[PDB]
Amino acid sequence: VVANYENASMAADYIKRVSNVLPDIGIICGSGLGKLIEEIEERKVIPYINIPNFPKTTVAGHVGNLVLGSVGGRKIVAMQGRLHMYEGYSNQEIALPIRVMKLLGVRVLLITNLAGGINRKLKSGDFVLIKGHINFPGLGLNNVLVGPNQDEFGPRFPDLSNAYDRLLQQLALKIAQENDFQDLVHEGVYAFNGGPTYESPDESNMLLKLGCDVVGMSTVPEVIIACHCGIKVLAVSLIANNSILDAENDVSINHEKVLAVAEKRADLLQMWFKEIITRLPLD
Amino acid sequence: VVANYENASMAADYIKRVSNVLPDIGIICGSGLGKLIEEIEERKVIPYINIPNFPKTTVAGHVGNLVLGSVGGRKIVAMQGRLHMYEGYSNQEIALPIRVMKLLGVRVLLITNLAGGINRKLKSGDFVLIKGHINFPGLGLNNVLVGPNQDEFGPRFPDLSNAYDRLLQQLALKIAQENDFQDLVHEGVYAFNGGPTYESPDESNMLLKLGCDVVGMSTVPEVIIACHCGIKVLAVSLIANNSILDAENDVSINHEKVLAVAEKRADLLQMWFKEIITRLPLD
Amino acid sequence: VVANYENASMAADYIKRVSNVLPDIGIICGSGLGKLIEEIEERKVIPYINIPNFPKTTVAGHVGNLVLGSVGGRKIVAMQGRLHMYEGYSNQEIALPIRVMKLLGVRVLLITNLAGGINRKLKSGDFVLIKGHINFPGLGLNNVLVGPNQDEFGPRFPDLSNAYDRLLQQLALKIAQENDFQDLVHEGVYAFNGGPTYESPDESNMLLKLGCDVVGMSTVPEVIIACHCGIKVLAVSLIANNSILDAENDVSINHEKVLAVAEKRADLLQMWFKEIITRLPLD
Ligand code: HPA
Ligand code: HPA
Ligand code: HPA
Asked: Where does hypoxanthine bind (chains A, B, C) (predicted)?
């Protein structure tokens, strides 16, 4: 199923009938960072399998829901259960939910993820406001926009110069200052590793020479689809470990340690994004 | 349809019957740089959709023709309407027209494209004679030759050390000196970004560290297929903008500005390649 | 055919019935480096086409056998006829034979390959014990593990920090010292170029800046599948040429010169790995 104007409209038609919510804000949370989706007020949970033209996620399994409701007086739509390209999903399957968000009226997309630190200033438990990215799949002919262009959503050759909104980064940093955890908040360039293997010690060493501050396996496809159709983006990475430090000390990297860091920071991140949603500018 | 010896021969059989032209030179022009195809003498225009085994281009749309005729006393065949890999075409679809050119008797392939400047010495409106390339799709298992090797056309492991002919670069530079626009002609290494998104500011910064002078979204697949079967190549990039300058000044990159640069330089490039064709060495 | 637990078991069932050999060691040899497969004692040769669920190799042609028997008192299984990803094989086709090796009881995998030298200390005819790798296909969303994870074999996010066993590298180096050819044995980082084109002179220059010592077109997919399911790996590259030297002197790179180097070093490499197999630690 192509993520075109007609197929995305069929999905939005179903969502509009099931919930009265017309959201202005979209949210995609990383694994273990989705507790905020539980406190959505007046919420409607729609499984992916019930939405027309939504991608099939049975092979991977686990949760896959679209949740719509209110947070701090704001109408939002949240993706519960993230689609990652290392699972084998095509460009069309990744793009359709974001373009359905666009047809529902989403103008701001807030994204969180887990990732590894490359810049020696980044430690486990730090946050990174993403101000730019280095897209290795895109350079190697695996860009999420490879294929025919859907002209109703955006241009054939998008400009990514301002994909990460400056004013949204300033707002997130100010809220961190107001609550005195600005000592955990950095800015940096995000490198897209397709995955699913963690970067080898020598791959981390290469990313250090290339100017990468953070490396992860997601986010960049969603940001490009959102920037393509004109949706503002705020992207925040939670640093689970510094792979340059781990290479020097021969310390292993595994998913159990990563999720433990997510649990250590889940509540603080939930409070942070709840206030960001509340403080998002109006018209 | 595989771009094998049998399928390419079926296409060449049709072309040979429709036109008496046996071309020695092949031409592929970038968007907005194809006015020379309008001045082909005694020309025959063959739409792609009429040629057996030629790739289907209806989804992308727009012009797609094979034009055969004479330029300056030389017999040429021109591709009007370029096939780009960011559109979703497979390796086989890209390769077949060049291998059909080979079966028609083409020995020299002349290519132009639009691209962005990385080397700080490159300005908008400059020309770059490509003397080498850095193929990011090829390194990441998306090389145009990935798949079974068609032994009738070339070897399994081609050498790209001399893919860009030295004597053809010298000839193009001499013609520029004879007409006093050598101050616009540079040499450089071409980086292949799969596209279709323009390079982010940080991706341009990485390409500067990697030694890339120019970055674009085409040409390298055609050069590899041509070098595979023994066709000499001359490749010229027209610099639409310097993305390193644009990153420092936060200036946007879009296709409208790119085509305006192509229109600014179209006539000069048409005169240039008309003389290159005329001056190409004989046997 | 997916390389899952059920399909690999069907292949192992057939292999177990055809040969009484329960191997503990697996071997994959590069082109021209497989003479050791001829001296397997009490050996059984099983063509790939006869094994259920084994990938189809008729399009590429040439030899494709699984050989099981004894070397120096050790029970081994050898892949005769290597599957390379530049041929067009999918992730599932590459992975299945290694996962069948795992189900047969293989705990150590020994791999050899031909490659080009980047580090200026590497000359033609040298050996390189691979201690790490830089996987460009993996970074660009062409990792061999992209797709659904087969949980019976390994985790979703594997750690590659110790994919190349330290103790196996020490053993191979000691045997080289015992026979006085340690002056040919180096250590280095292996870069994975998808192929099938040899690296351009500028691509070799980039790999020099990125810290790559060796570049080749294989091995890394097999190492990742083996590390995924817990198989120890020893990987040795034979340097056919130094492409940085060849770029400075404009010397061509072709497969005929590469195979001549393999023939020059075949017997020494056969003696080397025969002793490595004999000296592999017991329980
Ligand atoms: O090192 C890592 N840690 C956590 N997440 C990651 N995603 C890519 N690399 C890493
Ligand atoms: O910056 C650019 N400008 C014009 N063409 C391009 N192709 C890739 N990047 C660019
Ligand atoms: O330069 C080379 N020589 C031999 N094998 C190779 N594999 C990749 N590059 C090379």
From this structure: 199, 241
In the Cβ-directed half-sphere of A269, how many Cα atoms lie within 13 Å?
31
- Distance CA(C56)–CA(C65), nearest Å, equals 12
A/B interface, count of CB pairs below 8 Å: 112
Superfamily assignment of A1-283 in CATH?
Nucleoside phosphorylase domain (3.40.50.1580)
- Distance (Å, whole) CA A131 – CA A99: 23
Name the residue with the closest Cα to ligand 3, atom 2.
C116
Q: 3-class SS at C70?
A: strand
CA of B198 to the centre of ligand 2 (A): 6
Structure's resolution in angstroms: 2.1
Q: How was this structure determined?
A: X-ray
Nearest alpha carbon to residue A193 among A121, A118, A109:
A118
**Going by DSSP bridges, is the β-strand pair C108-117/C41-47 parallel, antiparallel, or unpaired?**
unpaired
DSSP one-letter code for B113:
E
Q: What is the 3-state secondary structure (H, E, C) of chain A?
A: CCCCHHHHHHHHHHHHHHCCCCCCEEEECCCCCCHHHHHCEEEEEEEHHHCCCCCCCCCCCCCCEEEEEEECCEEEEEEECCCCHHHCCCHHHHHHHHHHHHHHCCCEEEEEEEEEECCCCCCCCCEEEEEEEEEHHHHCCCCCCCCCCCCCCCCCCCCCCCCECHHHHHHHHHHHHHCCCHHHEEEEEEEECCCCCCCCHHHHHHHHHCCCCEEECCCHHHHHHHHHCCCEEEEEEEEEEEHHHHHHHCCCCCHHHHHHHHHHHHHHHHHHHHHHHHHCCCC
Which residues line the pocket of ligand 1, CB cutoff 6 A? A 114-116, 193, 198-199, 215-217, 240-241, 243, 253, 258
Tokens 């529902």 label which residue? Answer: A104
Cα of C122 vs centre of ligand 3, distance in Å, is: 13
Please tell me which of the candidates A87, A137, A209 has its beta carbon nearest to residue C140. A137
Q: Chain C contacts of B208, Cβ < 8 Å? A: none
> CB-hemisphere CA count at 13 Å for B31?
17
Q: How many CA atoms lie within 13 A of A52 on its CB side?
A: 13
Q: Was B101 annotated as part of a binding site?
A: no
Q: Pick the residue from chain B with its C-alpha nearest to C256.
A: B157
Q: Of ligand 2's atoms, which has the minimum distance to the CA of residue B114?
A: 5
**What's the C198 CA to ligand 3 centre distance in angstroms?**
6
- Residue B226 token pair: 């041509």
Q: List helix spans (H) across C3-124.
A: 5-18, 91-104
- Mapping DSSP to helix (H, G, I), strand (E, B) and coil, where does residue B230 land? coil
Tokens of C120: 């200026």
Q: Do B146 and C201 touch (CB under 8 A)?
A: no
A65-71 and A41-47 as β-strands: parallel, antiparallel, unpaired? antiparallel
Domain extents in chain C:
1-283
